[PDB]
Structures are given as C-alpha cells and as structure tokens.
Design a protein around this ligand. Structure first.
Ligand SMILES: N[C@@H](Cc1c[nH]c2ccccc12)C(=O)O
Ligand SMILES: N[C@@H](Cc1c[nH]c2ccccc12)C(=O)O
Ligand SMILES: N[C@@H](Cc1c[nH]c2ccccc12)C(=O)O
Ligand SMILES: N[C@@H](Cc1c[nH]c2ccccc12)C(=O)O
Ligand SMILES: N[C@@H](Cc1c[nH]c2ccccc12)C(=O)O
Ligand SMILES: N[C@@H](Cc1c[nH]c2ccccc12)C(=O)O
Ligand SMILES: N[C@@H](Cc1c[nH]c2ccccc12)C(=O)O
Ligand SMILES: N[C@@H](Cc1c[nH]c2ccccc12)C(=O)O
Ligand SMILES: N[C@@H](Cc1c[nH]c2ccccc12)C(=O)O
Ligand SMILES: N[C@@H](Cc1c[nH]c2ccccc12)C(=O)O
Ligand SMILES: N[C@@H](Cc1c[nH]c2ccccc12)C(=O)O
Lengths: 69, 67, 69, 69, 68, 70, 68, 69, 70, 68, 69
C-alpha cells in the first residue's frame, strides 16, 4: 500500500487518520514536533490522512506543503 | 488504491465523497481550512470525490486547481 | 480502477455516468458549477462517462476539453 | 480494462459498442453532439468500439481522428 | 487484454477476426468505410486480426499501414 | 493478454505459420497474406512459435525485423 | 512491502514503529548511533514509522532529513 | 512468457528447443532457410533455446548474433 | 519477490544485523563482514529490518547510502 | 522466469546448470562451440548458472564477459 | 525472483549461500576461478549471498566490486 512522508516544520503538527468504511471520523492524531518525520501508510483502518500545521509532505504525486494558521 | 492530494487555498474548502454502487449520493464532506492538506483514497465506500472551493489538487494525472 | 478528472469551466457542466452491463442508459448526472472539480472512477456500476458543457478533463491518456452546445 | 476518449467534432457522432463473445453485432450506439466527450471502457459486454463521424480520439496508443463520410 | 486501432483510409476496409483455439477460421468481418475508426480487443474468441484494404493501424508496437 | 506480433506482407503469398504448443512441434495453421495485408497474431494456448516465410515487415515488443523470401 | 532507509547523523536517533490496526501506539523504538544505518520495512505489525533526531532518510519518494 | 526472434542469415540455421525439467535434451530442431523469421516462446516444454548457424537474434536484452560453424 | 540490500564492507568488522519480523523486535543474526566482502541480503519471513554497523557502502532500490563507524 | 543469453566466443564453452533446492550440484553442462548462442531460463530445476570459457553474456542487468 | 551476476577477477573467489529461515548459516560455497561467471538467484533455500575474493558483481541496483584480502 501507498504511504505519505510528513516532516514537521514547526511544533505541534497534527497528522490525522480518518476511518475506512461507511463512517468517517478521526481515529488518531499523531503530534509531530519541529524536525520530526512520520512515514505513514494507508491501511485497513486508515483511508484518508489530514495534515494540520506547517509541514513538508511527499507522496507519489510529488511535494506539497501544508501551512498552519 | 489510488489517492488524491488536496491543499486548501482558502477557508471552508469542501472535499465531498460520493457513494460507490447503484446509488449515488454524498456521504461525507470534509471541511479544510486554509493551508490544510488532505490525502484521500478511493475506497469500498467512495468512488468519486468532489472538491468545492479554492484548492491545489494533485493526482496521478498531474496538478489541477479548483476555484 | 482508472479515474477521470473534470474541472468545470462554466456553470452547469453535467458529468453523466452510463450503466455497466448488457443495457446502456444513464444512471447518475452530477452537475458541477464553474471551478468545481470532480474526480470519478469507473466502477461496478459505471463503464462509460459522458461530459456535457465546457470542461477541462484529465485522464491517463492526457488532457482533453469538452465544449458546450 | 482499457478505455477510449472520444470528443465529437461535429453533431451526430456515433460511438458503437460491438458484442463480446462468439457473435458480433452492435448492441448500443451512443450519439454525441459537437464538443461532447465520452470516456468509454472495454467491458464484459463490449470488446470492440466503432466511431462514425468526425471525432478526436485518444487511446493508450495515441491520438487518432475519425472523419465523417 | 491488448487492442488495435484501425482507421479506414478508403471505403470497404475489412477487419477480420480469426478464431481462438485448435481450429482457425474467420468468424467475423467488420466493414469500415473511409474515415471510420475501429478499436478492437483480442478476446476469448479472437486471437488474431487481419486487415485488408488501405488503413492506418496503431498497436502497442507502434504504427503500421495496410495497403489495398 | 499474451504478446502478439504484427506482420505486414511486402509481396503476395507471405506465409504466417503457427506451430503447436506442447511436447510435439508441427504447424497447425498457415495464413497466407497478399501484398499490403496486415496480420496481428497472438501467442496462445495452441500457438507457441510463429514462423514467417516470404518478404514481410514485422513488429514485436523487441522492435522491427524483416523477413526476406526464397 | 515498501521500506525506508535511515542513516543517523548524530547519536541517539530513534526510529519508532507504530502499530497496525484499529489502535495506534508505539511498539518498538530502535536507537541508532551516529553513522548507523537502519533499513526498515512496513509489516503486519508496523504501518507507520516515526524518526526523531538528526537523520538522512530515503524512501521511494526521495530524500528527506529529520532534525533534532 | 518471454520470446526470442530469430532471423536466419544463411540456409540451414537450426533453432533447438531444450526440454524443461530434471533432464536436459533436444526435443525439437526447427530448420530456417535464409531470410526466414521464427518468433518462439519459452514454454512448459522448452526452457532453453540453442541457435546454430548464422542468425540475427532479438530478445528483451537486446540484439545478439550467432555465427556459422 | 522481496527487496534486497547490497552491503560492501569498507573496513574490517562490519556487522549486518537482522531484526525479527513480528510482534517482537530483537536481533536474530549478526553477520560479520571483513574489508572488501560483499553481502546481498533479502527481507524475508524472518527478517523485516536490517541494521548496518561500521563503515560500509550500501545500495538499495532508493540509491546509495554509506554507513560510518564510531 | 528470467533468462540469460550466452554467445560462445571460442570452442568448448560450458554453460552449467546448478540444482535448485537444499543440495547444490551440477546437473547439466551444455557445450557451446564458437559462435553458438544459448538462451536459458532459470527454472524449477535450475536456480544458478555457471559459464566457463570465453563468452559474451546478456542479462537483465546488462552485458558481462566470461574469460577462459 | 532476483538474481546476481558474479564474475571472478582472481582465482578462488567464493560465492556463499546463507540459509533462509529462522537459522542463518552457510549451506553452500561455490568456488569460481578467474574469468568464470556465476548467475545466481535468491531461492527457497538461499535468502542472502556473500562474495569473498576479487569479483565484479551486477545486481538490479547496479555494479559493486568485492575485493580480496
Ligand atoms: N470513510 C471514508 C473515508 C474517505 C476516503 N476517501 C474519501 C474521500 C472523500 C470523503 C471521505 C473519504 C471511506 O473509507 O470511503
Ligand atoms: N455510485 C456511482 C458513483 C460514480 C462513480 N463514477 C461516476 C461517474 C459518473 C457518475 C457517477 C459516478 C458508482 O459507484 O458508479
Ligand atoms: N453498458 C455498456 C456501456 C459501454 C461501455 N463501453 C461502451 C462502448 C460503446 C457503447 C457502450 C459502452 C457496457 O458496459 O459494455
Ligand atoms: N465478438 C467479437 C468482437 C471482436 C473483438 N475483437 C474483434 C476483432 C475482429 C472481429 C471481431 C472482434 C469478440 O468478442 O471476439
Ligand atoms: N486458432 C489459432 C489462431 C492463431 C493465433 N495466432 C496465430 C499465429 C499463427 C497461426 C494461427 C494463429 C490460435 O488460437 O492459436
Ligand atoms: N512445441 C514447442 C514449440 C516451441 C516453442 N518454443 C520453441 C523453441 C524451440 C523449439 C520449439 C519450440 C513448445 O511448445 O515448447
Ligand atoms: N493504527 C493505524 C496507524 C496508522 C497508519 N497510517 C496512519 C495515518 C494517520 C494516523 C494513524 C495511522 C493503522 O494501522 O491504520
Ligand atoms: N532441463 C533444464 C534446461 C535448462 C534451463 N536452463 C538451464 C541452464 C543451464 C543448464 C540447463 C538448463 C531445466 O529445465 O532446468
Ligand atoms: N518486529 C518489527 C520490526 C520492524 C520492521 N519495521 C520497523 C519499523 C520500526 C520499528 C520496528 C520495525 C516488525 O516486524 O514490524
Ligand atoms: N541449491 C541452491 C543453489 C543456489 C542458488 N543461488 C545460490 C547462491 C549461493 C549458493 C547457492 C545457490 C539453491 O537453490 O538455493
Ligand atoms: N536466515 C535469515 C538470513 C537473512 C536474510 N537477510 C538477512 C539480513 C540480515 C541477517 C540475516 C539475514 C533469513 O532468512 O531471514
């Protein structure tokens, strides 16, 4: 299965997994502090991932950056 | 399964999942505020995705932007 | 399964799903307002997609544009 | 399955599906008007597709154009 | 499965399907008039395709032209 | 979804010969092509080798090759 | 399955595996000292990997660096 | 399965099929006259192919030429 | 099949350490390479992560990386 | 399965098949004379191939030459 | 299944197969004299290969050379 790479560019970045299935809700929020890297797959339990906070993200489609408020 | 990357370029962007099967309707709308990123797969329950609002979108076919 | 990307270039673009199987008819019409994007798969129920109205379309074969009546 | 993209360049374009199996006959003709785009797969029921009238066609092998009589 | 694209460059082009199996014969001939395009797969029933008449053909291996 | 070969006859009477798959090897079918005709033929349950006799332009996944007649 | 390469650029880099399943928690943390390389797969037990500390990382999507 | 293309560059080229399995012997020799092309797969019965005589050969790995005896 | 890594020892005493697949994570084998030896090692039913300790040149599908000793 | 192409560059080149399985031994040696080409798969019976003598060899990893 | 190519650059090169499974030991050592080439797969019995002595080695990841003591 595909995965996403998230590098936090500020403290308190949240990487949130959304449930697979007929229902959609957040099942887990991993907090990353500045400079930490998370490499996360899609899985039986996770079919969408939301990133909140300033982060550098890599997927198979290229680079994208999230920006916080 | 494939996925789409959606970065909101303004507040209040909606990423809407349409149901897989003989019946087509919206089943979830995820609200993204400015700068938030959602990476969302097609799934057993979602066979089309609609993006409403200003966003930068990446798919296997390249970049497209909603307005 | 493959998917198509449709970005509406005017209001009232109509993305039409045609039934898979021995019979052929439309089963769903999804209307897009200008600037909305729909990313839609081929599925168990949909084996052909028709686009009516001005739109920018991406598929695995490249870019094509529909033009309205 | 593979799919074809067909964009009508004049009114009255016919995209014709031919039956899969031991017998070969037309089972459906989708009429497209000028500027409409149809993205159609090969399927359990459709093993060959015929295009009549002026159209721009994309497949995995590239672009080809049909011309009307 | 693979497919072939055939564009007829004159009237009366024939695209002929040969049967899959221990027996080999033509089972269908599709007539194309000038400008018409046929996109045809290999299938449970068709394991070879013959093109007769002037046509522009694309396959995965590139382009080829038949001549009447 | 097996591989296939494209054969364009460059003279009349090109002979495309299918050989039997299996412990035994002989031809089971010969398809003659007139000049300018194109045959697109797969390997299959029954054909595991294809021989071309006569002048022809041939394409496969490995590129172009040309047969030359007797 | 895919894998990640992590080279520690300082002492005490932590490579942490998060559990696959309905629940998400850390199940192992491997400590790397400066200059050690760990090549780690995603697995039945590990569906997310976190890197804490200064490291050079390669995945299929390219190079990224974590910072202490 | 993979296949080889062999074009005979002189009369009497032999394309020899070696048996798959614990024993190894020649089960068939196909004689090619000058200019003939043989396109032959590896199969249930053939796991190695020997070419004797002058020939131009294409495989997935590129071109190679056999030389006369 | 599974991916593999190539390791070339650039000094004596390089250790290539296999970590167990499964719920438990521990070292199960450590192969010691002397200078100039090469090891080409798969991921397997029993090994889901590999650690290299000591100066070595390493190739994987993602490219070259070099480990360094203390 | 993958295959290798071997062209003999001198008489008496041997292409040797090593048995697949718990035991490793030579089960067949194919003698190639100068200019002959052998194209040989890995199989149920053969999991390694040794070339002895002067030969030009092609595999998916490119060209290599053995030397007498 | 992947394979490696090993060409001996000196006499007495050893290509060693290490057992697959919970236990790890040498099950076979193939000696190569100068100029011999061995092309060897990973297999049910062999999950790691060690090369000792001066050799030129090709894998999917490119070229590497072992050096003798
Ligand atoms: N529960 C939803 C989560 C989801 C995935 N992709 C989506 C796209 C849009 C909205 C929701 C989703 C599903 O598994 O289908
Ligand atoms: N329920 C429809 C949703 C859909 C997917 N792709 C479409 C294309 C057009 C119209 C509807 C759709 C389906 O699963 O088939
Ligand atoms: N019901 C038809 C729809 C279709 C798909 N591709 C086509 C091409 C031409 C005509 C109809 C179609 C089918 O599933 O086969
Ligand atoms: N009924 C035929 C339709 C067809 C597909 N490809 C063809 C090529 C030539 C003639 C007919 C065909 C089949 O399924 O096999
Ligand atoms: N009935 C033959 C048709 C065929 C396919 N490819 C060929 C090549 C040569 C001759 C005949 C054929 C078969 O299925 O095998
Ligand atoms: N009957 C043989 C035909 C064949 C295929 N490839 C070959 C190469 C050499 C000689 C014969 C063949 C087989 O199926 O195996
Ligand atoms: N337990 C989660 C771990 C996980 C994987 N990817 C994630 C993305 C975000 C949050 C958690 C996760 C799972 O297997 O699904
Ligand atoms: N009967 C042998 C033929 C063979 C294939 N590849 C080889 C390499 C070397 C020697 C013999 C072979 C086998 O099937 O395994
Ligand atoms: N026992 C762990 C080993 C492992 C693989 N990848 C990891 C990443 C981080 C920590 C441990 C691991 C597993 O099989 O999952
Ligand atoms: N019988 C051994 C042969 C072998 C293949 N690759 C090797 C590498 C090294 C030593 C022996 C081998 C096996 O099947 O595993
Ligand atoms: N017996 C071990 C051999 C092995 C493969 N890759 C390794 C990496 C490191 C240490 C040992 C190994 C196994 O099959 O898993």
């Amino acid at each position: 299965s595909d995965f996403v790479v998230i590098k936090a560019l500020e403290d308190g970045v949240n990487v949130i997994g959304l449930t697979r299935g007929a229902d959609t809700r957040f099942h887990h929020s991993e907090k990353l502090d500045k400079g930490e890297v998370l490499i996360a797959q899609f899985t039986e339990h996770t079919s969408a991932i939301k990133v909140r906070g300033k982060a550098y993200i890599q997927t198979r489609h290229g680079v994208i950056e999230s920006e916080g408020k």
